[PDB]
RNA sequence: CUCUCGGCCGAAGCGUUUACUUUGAAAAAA
RNA sequence: AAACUGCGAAUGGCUCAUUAAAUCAGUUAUGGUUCCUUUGGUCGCUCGUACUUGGAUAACUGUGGUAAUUCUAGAGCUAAUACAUGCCGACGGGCGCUGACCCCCUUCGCGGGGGGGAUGCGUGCAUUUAUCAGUGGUGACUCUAGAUAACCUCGGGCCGAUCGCACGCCCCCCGUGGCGGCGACGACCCAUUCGAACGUCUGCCCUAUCAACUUUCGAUGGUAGUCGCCGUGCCUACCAUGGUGACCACGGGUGACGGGGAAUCAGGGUUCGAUUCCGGAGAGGGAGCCUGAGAAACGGCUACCACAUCCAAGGAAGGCAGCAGGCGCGCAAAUU
């Protein structure tokens, strides 16, 4: 079938070579796993040595890490925005390694509000729900309030991430290969890389 | 081929087995085990060709299936079991103990040992690595893995193992002035004292050895096995003390023995 | 109940195929009308469809509900003896035994 | 800016450049810590590799490659590909029948790291073996020495 | 077996570290 | 061959580098 | 006996058609991969019906179909180390975060400190991602080991519902009696053995009446991906215009499988090597696959191409370059 050998290629000088053996089992190849966005659907593949490869065909969730805060959380995947290799992958919404995607921001906001006890992602209208009020304005003792006030010194986030939190969606990059391991894992974009990808996305439109 | 090979042509067998050409087409292919195929001695070869206990391969099986032979204190019924360097073979039925040691000709010799000596063996440290939970592990030349070794033991050293419990009793460090035997190459079977070690980064190291009579030679680092500390070995030596004679003096010794015979 | 049958060439009927005639199917382990000789072996075999037609050598039937009278060859015969259960739990289930 | 020329972001994989810090340490300098390693065998790391800002995953000093095998030498002949050059190795082959020699040559495509600059055609290069980096490249430039005509 | 081996190696490692530190201290003091 | 650092030797740089010759090691049996 | 289950059938044997930096030989590398089996190491390290759980299938007994096959169909029974499902115990706790409340110092007092703590979440080894610090080793790791936040695929990683032989010691006891010795089988993961697979350097016969070749359909290199057991134009997208060649590229021929070797030879050399050993390739020619640790296997399967067997014309079955043997071919080669 699909063979990824080296003897069907031309030589360095440019002349062609005559093969001396037919296709072998260990030189085989398999059709690509075009992973889309939807309810989870994964097929297992029996590979050389008796091992398994998890061929993810459909994925909708994955665990992403906020590196600056070191906060890893499991969040759903919403859409694909940018792809360096080819723009056809963006149109068909294919999940591959190093593609830029949009993920939900709710678990990160919950962790941030439970850690620093500061508002985040809230509108200027100051509308609130009592659960969030008791999460932020809880009655703490002197020692615990002392730790929280000290934590409030380091509570500061760049304007780009704050705007993304206001929008409700974050930009992330996938670091795992969905077609090989069956899961879509990655990290939240931030810093110079976030600016680079924002500029690329804006220029694409 | 499409997979592992299961046969061994008799002419393609190692030459230190001293097999003859006209007996048959095949030779006993050693089973997988602690020692390499080219550096072991199969149990059948030692049991019928060296000791003359059996005449055919069937009699070797009839001996082995009576659970008479023990290798390193454990009963082996496989007739092609790979037995290698510094191994102990015990036959309780006849009360005999042997240790596989190369002679000066590079062949395994029938070397009888005291039953007290048959309780331990020497091993060469091949690998040192830390495993899960920060536990050191030591891997020897005969595939033995030992947990929690002495922190001072490094690679290319020698450890003494008690065959009953399989635990280290003591060790010899790889330093100049110790006693070593060559386990491979052109100087296989020679015994001497390490003189100096040459280090070649990215390549093989070369070690110089000098014997009792003053003859000097060199080998690669992988072919050296430390036997004893200083000039005193920790095991019993074969008839030849590890000194290789030239052809002229072998002829002289043979003629002297013939003259004194009769 | 219609169990199966064979057409005039002796080929058996398979449940899945919905036709009046014969087809050729690549059969592997776990399929009816085929018995592999090697592990992983598959073979192309001719199989008659499941739909009952007039071109059948024999048709198999299983009685599920009994009628007014009983056929002299089929029903009036006494039931034959058969092997009993071999697993202990099935013994207990058949004879309503307790743990004691 | 000058480094970012591809559709994908060019980053050093083993360096985390998004570590947050106080506003006082941000004003000082935005200087990313450089990743480099000693390749061994007595070869020294060029100062341009340590102090540089280029990104090259195939660089022997700042990339993910391992130098093991044979160490060879050649003369630079062509510099027209991106980050890889063509060198020529000359030798003599002995013919037993005539007791003489004949001149022979080989061409090698080797990878050239951005840390090595001011490399001209006709200077000596010492290369080391690594894993296959492309269809025809198996060696990486380790040292560059100038020609005899250097002033 | 796990417990006994762990305890024995803990004792041996304490002995080795103490010996090394003592020798280093003697070398530094001299 | 060369200072330095460590126990006359040990480490490190050697050699502007080769070609040549003489050693040594690794080199299936038949 | 038969049948289910497990293993082997990928070794061996035959031939030399293809194949000219290809195969192959010497020399190196995998710090860029997989590995049945043997040997050794782990296997209460997880804090959350068990005195043994479930449904079927053969062999067997009966009824049949077809001219025909190592074709099988229906009905009645019954097993597991087949197929599935699932606990107890160790289990007392320990450690990370959350932390109402309770104390002990200084302070006139706020304030500045030091402890204890109920209640909640997580926890072991493997898997995927992100971050932090720097036990043992290499010439060199983005190595090994450690810490932190999570994840952990229903086409699902481990954490024993298996078998044999000798059978004994203990209790407020005669019981739900408790404990115990050798083995066999199985299993996640390391190490080892047998390898396999991709790489590095050098090396091959004639031919210019073959002088330029490669790049539309990857040719040379870069970036990101896909696929693969892994490294790589192996493939994809976007890019640069590269790469080879009188030191003979490219093309053609070979009555070319390559070496260890053989004949002849003063010293040089010439010719041969299908052939018992080591590598390679093939099973009439191509191609595609199932199972399995390992095959693009052919005394395995599926098609096409060429031959070719039985037939009741509806269908069924093929591969001697394995041992004998037969036809043909030829100057040319043995016993069913
Ligand atoms: Mg071929
Ligand atoms: Mg074969
Ligand atoms: Mg064998
Ligand atoms: Mg001559
Ligand atoms: Mg040889
Ligand atoms: Mg020879
Ligand atoms: Mg069977
Ligand atoms: Mg098999
Ligand atoms: Mg034969
Ligand atoms: Mg080779
Ligand atoms: Mg690899
Ligand atoms: Mg293994
Ligand atoms: Mg039935
Ligand atoms: Mg099972
Ligand atoms: Mg680690
Ligand atoms: Mg790539
Ligand atoms: Mg590329
Ligand atoms: Mg020839
Ligand atoms: Mg030919
Ligand atoms: Mg001559
Ligand atoms: Mg002559
Ligand atoms: Mg030959
Ligand atoms: Mg030949
Ligand atoms: Mg021929
Ligand atoms: Mg084949
Ligand atoms: Mg054939
Ligand atoms: Mg034929
Ligand atoms: Mg065919
Ligand atoms: Mg198998
Ligand atoms: Mg085939
Ligand atoms: Mg045949
Ligand atoms: Mg065959
Ligand atoms: Mg024949
Ligand atoms: Mg026949
Ligand atoms: Mg003749
Ligand atoms: Mg004839």
């Amino acid at each position: 079938g699909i063979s990824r050998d080296n003897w069907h290629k031309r030589r360095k000088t440019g002349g062609k070579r005559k093969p001396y053996h037919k296709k072998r089992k260990y030189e085989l190849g398999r059709p690509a796993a075009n992973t889309k966005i939807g309810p989870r659907r994964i097929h297992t593949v029996r590979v050389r040595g008796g091992n398994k490869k998890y061929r993810a065909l459909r994925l909708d969730v994955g665990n992403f890490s906020w590196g600056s805060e070191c906060c890893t959380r499991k969040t759903r995947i919403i859409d694909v925005v940018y792809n360096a290799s080819n723009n056809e992958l963006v149109r068909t919404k294919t999940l591959v390694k190093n593609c830029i995607v949009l993920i939900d921001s709710t678990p990160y906001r919950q962790w941030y509000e439970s850690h620093y006890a500061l508002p985040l992602g809230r509108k200027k209208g100051a509308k609130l729900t009592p659960e969030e009020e008791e999460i932020l304005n809880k009655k703490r003792s002197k020692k615990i309030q002392k730790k929280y006030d000290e934590r409030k010194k380091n509570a500061k986030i760049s304007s780009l991430l704050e705007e993304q939190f206001q929008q409700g969606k974050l930009l992330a990059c996938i670091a795992s290969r969905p077609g090989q391991c069956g899961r879509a894992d990655g990290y939240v974009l931030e810093g110079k890389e976030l600016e680079f990808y924002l500029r690329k996305i804006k220029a694409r439109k | 081929a499409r997979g592992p090979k299961k046969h061994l042509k008799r002419v393609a067998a190692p030459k230190h087995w001293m097999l003859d050409k006209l007996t048959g087409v095949f030779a006993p292919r050693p089973s997988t085990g602690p020692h390499k195929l080219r550096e072991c001695l199969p149990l059948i070869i030692f049991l019928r060709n060296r000791l003359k206990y059996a005449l055919t391969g069937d009699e070797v099986k009839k001996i082995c299936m009576q659970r008479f032979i023990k290798i390193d204190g454990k009963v082996r019924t496989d007739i092609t079991y790979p037995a290698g360097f510094m191994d102990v073979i015990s036959i309780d039925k006849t009360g005999e103990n042997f240790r596989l040691i190369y002679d000066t000709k590079g062949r395994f010799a029938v070397h009888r040992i005291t039953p007290e000596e048959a309780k331990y063996k020497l091993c060469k440290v091949r690998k040192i690595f830390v495993g899960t939970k920060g536990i050191p592990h030591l891997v020897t030349h005969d595939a033995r893995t030992i947990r929690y070794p002495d922190p001072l033991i490094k690679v290319n050293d020698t450890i003494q193992i008690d065959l009953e419990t399989g635990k280290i009793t003591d060790f010899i460090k790889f330093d100049t002035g110790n006693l070593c035997m060559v386990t491979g190459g052109a100087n296989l079977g020679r015994i001497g004292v390490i003189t100096n070690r040459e280090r070649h980064p990215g390549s093989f190291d070369v070690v110089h050895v000098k014997d009792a009579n003053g003859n000097s030679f060199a080998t690669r680092l992988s072919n050296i096995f430390v036997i004893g500390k200083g000039n005193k070995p920790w095991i019993s030596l074969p008839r030849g003390k590890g000194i290789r004679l030239t052809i002229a003096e072998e002829r002289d010794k043979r003629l002297a023995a013939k003259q004194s015979s009769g | 109940r219609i169990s199966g049958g064979n057409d005039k060439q002796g080929f058996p009927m398979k449940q899945g195929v919905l036709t009046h005639g014969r087809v050729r199917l690549l059969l592997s382990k776990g399929h009816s009308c085929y018995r592999p000789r090697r592990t992983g072996e598959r073979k192309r075999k001719s199989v008659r469809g499941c739909i009952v037609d007039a071109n059948l050598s024999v048709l198999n039937l299983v009685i599920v509900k009994k009628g007014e009278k009983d056929i002299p060859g089929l029903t009036d015969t006494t039931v034959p003896r058969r092997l009993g259960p071999k697993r202990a739990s099935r013994i207990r289930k058949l004879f309503n035994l307790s743990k004691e | 800016a000058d480094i970012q020329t591809e559709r994908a972001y060019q980053k050093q994989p083993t360096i985390f450049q998004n570590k947050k810090r106080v506003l006082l340490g941000e004003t000082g300098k935005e200087k990313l810590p450089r990743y480099y390693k000693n390749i061994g065998l007595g070869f020294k790391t060029p100062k341009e590799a340590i102090e540089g800002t280029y990104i090259d995953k195939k660089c022997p000093f700042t990339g993910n490659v391992s130098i093991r095998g044979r160490i060879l030498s050649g003369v630079v002949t062509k510099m027209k590909m991106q980050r890889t050059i063509v060198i020529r190795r000359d030798y003599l082959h002995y013919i037993r029948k005539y007791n003489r020699f004949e001149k022979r040559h080989k061409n090698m495509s080797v990878h050239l790291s951005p840390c090595f600059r001011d490399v001209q055609i006709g200077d000596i290069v010492t290369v080391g073996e690594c894993r296959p980096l492309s269809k025809t490249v198996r060696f990486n430039v380790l040292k560059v020495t100038k020609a005899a005509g250097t002033k | 077996k796990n417990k006994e081996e762990a305890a024995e190696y803990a004792k041996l490692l304490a002995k080795r570290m103490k010996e090394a530190k003592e020798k280093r201290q003697e070398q530094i003091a001299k």
Side-chain angles (χ1 to χ4, degrees):
Chain A
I2 304 179
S3 184
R4 53 193 311 274
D5 49 68
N6 299 328
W7 45 263
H8 77 283
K9 205 86 177 184
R10 282 186 170 271
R11 287 192 171 92
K12 181 184 177 183
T13 64
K16 57 184 299 298
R17 55 169 68 94
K18 298 177 182 177
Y20 81 102
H21 71 79
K22 62 193 299 181
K23 292 186 179 182
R24 290 295 153 91
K25 167 73 175 185
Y26 57 87
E27 301 169 338
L28 68 84
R30 298 192 184 94
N34 304 286
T35 303
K36 297 302 183 301
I37 298 182
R40 183 169 62 185
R41 171 180 294 185
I42 304 175
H43 292 178
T44 52
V45 177
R46 197 273 193 189
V47 305
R48 184 179 190 84
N51 310 96
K52 294 186 302 179
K53 274 184 181 178
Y54 306 90
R55 183 127 301 171
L57 301 181
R58 296 177 180 180
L59 294 175
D60 57 328
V61 295
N63 60 324
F64 297 91
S65 184
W66 196 1
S68 60
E69 305 293 337
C70 194
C71 174
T72 310
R73 289 297 180 275
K74 177 185 174 182
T75 323
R76 91 168 205 174
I77 303 181
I78 305 181
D79 193 64
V80 183
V81 290
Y82 185 76
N83 190 283
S85 297
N86 185 13
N87 203 37
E88 179 72 15
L89 304 178
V90 170
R91 187 181 65 91
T92 57
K93 276 73 183 176
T94 302
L95 296 180
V96 296
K97 179 178 171 57
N98 202 20
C99 77
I100 310 300
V101 294
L102 279 168
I103 64 179
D104 190 11
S105 316
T106 33
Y108 302 105
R109 191 209 83 266
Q110 295 180 10
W111 175 88
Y112 185 88
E113 294 187 359
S114 301
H115 191 274
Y116 300 98
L118 263 68
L120 182 116
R122 310 292 179 176
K123 279 194 172 184
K124 201 172 183 177
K127 55 185 64 179
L128 283 179
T129 331
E131 290 76 10
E132 285 74 357
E133 296 185 12
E134 76 171 343
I135 285 179
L136 293 179
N137 309 122
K138 194 160 58 183
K139 178 208 64 177
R140 306 172 175 94
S141 64
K142 293 294 180 61
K143 292 185 177 180
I144 283 81
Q145 278 293 339
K146 184 180 180 303
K147 300 193 309 176
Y148 268 90
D149 206 337
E150 177 64 28
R151 291 180 183 177
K152 291 177 183 177
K153 284 289 186 178
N154 304 324
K156 186 56 183 179
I157 302 187
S158 64
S159 61
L160 310 172
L161 285 181
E162 287 178 338
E163 290 174 345
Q164 280 184 152
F165 274 111
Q166 296 291 326
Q167 287 283 357
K169 299 178 296 299
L170 296 176
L171 282 172
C173 181
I174 295 181
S176 63
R177 302 149 68 178
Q180 306 289 326
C181 63
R183 56 183 77 176
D185 302 357
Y187 55 87
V188 183
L189 287 180
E190 57 187 13
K192 304 295 298 181
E193 183 175 9
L194 174 58
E195 306 177 14
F196 174 86
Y197 281 117
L198 282 173
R199 184 171 66 258
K200 286 296 178 178
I201 293 177
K202 181 183 58 181
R204 186 54 195 174
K205 305 172 183 176
Chain B
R2 286 174 285 164
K5 305 172 71 65
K6 305 181 181 177
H7 296 67
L8 183 71
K9 292 298 168 58
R10 175 170 278 258
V11 75
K15 200 199 172 184
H16 69 267
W17 299 359
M18 294 173 297
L19 291 176
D20 63 328
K21 67 171 59 180
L22 297 184
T23 287
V25 182
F26 297 98
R29 183 183 181 89
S31 303
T32 53
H35 303 275
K36 283 184 173 299
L37 189 148
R38 308 293 300 184
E39 308 171 337
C40 72
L41 180 66
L43 187 55
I44 172 178
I45 305 299
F46 178 80
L47 216 54
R48 75 169 180 188
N49 288 317
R50 295 300 102 88
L51 298 182
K52 310 295 191 306
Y53 277 123
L55 304 191
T56 60
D58 185 72
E59 302 184 357
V60 179
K61 173 254 304 177
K62 286 183 176 183
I63 293 179
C64 289
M65 294 306 302
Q66 294 181 281
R67 319 191 90 257
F68 285 161
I69 314 296
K70 298 169 57 185
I71 296 187
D72 292 340
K74 313 191 69 176
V75 174
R76 308 299 186 182
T77 55
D78 188 11
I79 70 172
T80 55
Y81 185 84
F85 185 67
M86 203 75 74
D87 278 9
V88 179
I89 303 177
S90 300
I91 307 176
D92 296 355
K93 198 67 177 180
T94 58
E96 295 178 351
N97 297 268
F98 309 90
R99 173 164 285 164
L100 292 183
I101 297 295
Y102 296 110
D103 58 5
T104 183
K105 297 283 188 173
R107 290 121 48 175
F108 283 112
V110 179
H111 182 52
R112 295 177 166 84
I113 60 180
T114 305
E116 284 63 276
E117 183 174 327
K119 294 192 172 64
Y120 70 97
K121 68 175 292 176
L122 298 184
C123 304
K124 179 184 174 184
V125 181
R126 287 275 189 85
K127 184 178 298 186
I128 294 290
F129 65 95
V130 178
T132 312
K133 306 300 176 61
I135 301 179
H137 293 75
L138 177 152
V139 174
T140 72
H141 78 278
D142 51 356
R144 291 176 176 265
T145 60
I146 304 179
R147 302 199 311 171
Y148 301 112
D150 194 304
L152 300 180
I153 302 180
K154 307 299 181 181
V155 195
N156 301 123
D157 296 352
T158 297
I159 55 181
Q160 176 172 134
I161 260 58
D162 182 67
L163 291 182
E164 178 180 341
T165 54
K167 295 183 175 302
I168 307 178
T169 54
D170 49 357
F171 64 99
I172 309 172
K173 188 71 178 176
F174 183 86
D175 296 320
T176 59
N178 289 323
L179 200 66
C180 68
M181 172 185 286
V182 186
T183 60
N187 299 277
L188 166 60
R190 297 232 269 178
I191 303 176
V193 173
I194 300 181
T195 296
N196 70 321
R197 166 179 173 175
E198 300 181 359
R199 319 179 77 97
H200 301 95
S203 181
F204 314 98
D205 293 2
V206 178
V207 189
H208 294 70
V209 191
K210 188 170 61 178
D211 63 353
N213 295 158
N215 306 326
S216 179
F217 56 93
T219 46
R220 287 185 179 180
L221 182 54
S222 57
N223 292 332
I224 289 202
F225 198 112
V226 186
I227 303 302
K229 178 177 180 57
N231 295 325
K232 303 299 171 298
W234 288 19
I235 60 172
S236 183
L237 292 188
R239 176 79 72 87
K241 295 299 124 180
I243 294 116
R244 173 179 292 174
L245 308 180
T246 72
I247 46 180
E249 50 200 22
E250 290 185 24
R251 172 203 62 190
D252 294 352
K253 182 183 64 174
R254 179 193 65 195
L255 289 181
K258 272 191 173 183
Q259 291 288 348
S260 301
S261 302
Chain C
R1 192 193 76 193
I2 302 178
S3 288
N6 298 91
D7 62 343
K8 296 179 180 177
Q9 274 65 50
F11 292 97
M13 304 167 56
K14 224 174 186 302
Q15 172 69 242
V17 284
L18 307 170
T19 34
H20 302 88
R22 291 196 301 266
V23 296
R24 301 212 74 183
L25 301 184
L26 186 62
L27 303 173
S28 56
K29 191 185 65 175
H31 278 75
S32 59
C33 310
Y34 174 63
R35 170 177 144 261
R37 302 303 189 273
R38 299 174 58 107
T39 56
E41 191 191 51
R42 306 183 295 181
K43 187 171 296 299
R44 189 85 59 171
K45 308 289 292 303
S46 302
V47 181
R48 168 67 159 80
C50 78
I51 299 178
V52 170
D53 209 3
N55 304 274
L56 284 172
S57 60
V58 63
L59 175 63
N60 305 340
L61 305 176
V62 172
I63 292 180
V64 290
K65 185 175 182 175
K66 190 178 170 177
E68 277 127 272
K69 292 298 186 179
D70 42 0
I71 312 302
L74 283 172
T75 309
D76 52 351
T77 311
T78 60
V79 296
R81 62 181 178 91
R82 58 193 68 175
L83 299 180
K86 185 172 163 58
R87 186 187 292 174
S89 73
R90 285 171 170 171
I91 294 275
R92 300 188 184 97
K93 182 176 300 178
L94 180 62
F95 293 104
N96 307 281
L97 303 186
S98 61
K99 283 189 260 185
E100 297 292 333
Chain D
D2 57 334
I3 299 302
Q4 309 299 325
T5 53
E6 293 285 348
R7 300 181 60 179
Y9 185 81
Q10 301 297 100
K11 189 183 60 178
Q12 228 169 358
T14 170
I15 292 294
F16 178 54
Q17 61 195 220
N18 290 328
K19 177 181 182 300
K20 77 170 189 178
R21 53 191 176 183
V22 301
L23 299 183
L24 293 179
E26 180 180 354
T27 310
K29 183 56 184 178
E30 295 79 2
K31 184 64 179 181
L32 302 184
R34 194 88 166 113
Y35 167 80
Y36 58 96
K37 64 172 179 295
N38 176 35
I39 71 176
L41 296 176
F43 295 92
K44 64 164 299 181
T45 303
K47 193 175 60 60
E48 296 76 36
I50 304 176
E51 307 180 320
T53 178
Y54 65 94
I55 299 302
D56 189 13
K57 64 180 181 181
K58 302 178 183 176
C59 175
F61 306 97
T62 63
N64 179 73
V65 296
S66 181
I67 296 301
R68 74 288 180 279
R70 304 179 182 268
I71 305 296
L72 303 185
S73 180
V75 296
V76 174
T77 50
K78 283 189 302 179
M79 307 177 300
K80 291 183 175 301
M81 297 174 296
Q82 297 186 350
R83 284 169 168 172
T84 158
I85 64 183
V86 175
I87 69 171
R88 174 165 178 165
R89 306 178 64 250
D90 301 325
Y91 58 99
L92 296 174
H93 181 254
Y94 176 81
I95 306 292
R96 183 201 289 101
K97 176 179 181 176
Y98 300 95
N99 304 90
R100 288 170 168 82
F101 303 87
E102 52 174 73
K103 174 69 168 54
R104 294 193 180 185
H105 86 286
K106 286 288 184 62
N107 283 16
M108 276 185 174
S109 294
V110 296
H111 183 271
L112 184 64
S113 180
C115 63
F116 296 109
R117 60 188 65 189
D118 293 326
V119 182
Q120 310 296 334
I121 292 181
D123 51 13
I124 320 294
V125 51
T126 299
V127 298
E129 193 193 316
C130 58
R131 58 176 172 84
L133 306 180
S134 65
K135 181 184 177 188
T136 63
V137 175
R138 283 88 171 92
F139 288 81
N140 221 327
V141 169
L142 300 185
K143 191 197 303 177
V144 178
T145 150
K146 304 297 298 179
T150 306
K151 51 186 177 179
Chain E
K1 174 259 303 173
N2 290 12
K3 165 186 294 295
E4 293 176 354
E5 291 181 346
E8 195 174 31
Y9 178 77
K11 184 178 305 180
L12 177 63
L13 181 63
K15 187 178 174 183
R16 283 291 177 264
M17 288 194 299
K18 183 175 185 177
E19 224 82 308
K21 207 173 187 181
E22 186 182 41
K23 180 165 295 181
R24 186 182 185 92
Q25 204 71 16
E26 181 180 354
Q27 292 191 19
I28 292 180
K30 175 183 178 182

